[PDB]
């Protein structure tokens, strides 16, 4: 939900959310940026 509106042109997400996403992941999923990253990649890649 947060990835789709904070997306602009698909796989081009501004750092403001590149982290905001990573952090919500790092928070909601409690995934240390390590875990969060893999996810950030999948979300951006998929949501792209």
């Amino acid at each position: 939900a947060f990835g789709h509106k904070y997306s602009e042109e698909g796989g081009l997400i501004n750092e403001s959310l590149r982290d905001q996403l990573l952090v919500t992941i790092q928070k909601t999923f409690t995934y240390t940026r390590t875990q969060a990253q893999h996810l950030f990649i999948i979300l951006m890649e998929c949501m792209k």
């Binding site: 982290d19 905001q20 952090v23 919500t24 790092q26 928070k27």
Partner: peptide
């Protein structure tokens, strides 16, 4: 109240990012 809902969603995101920085 819809404007309250949108603004408080932004306030929670800013507070969460501030906690991660701290």
């Amino acid at each position: 109240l819809e404007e309250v809902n949108e603004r408080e969603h932004s306030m929670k995101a800013s507070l969460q990012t501030v906690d991660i920085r701290l």
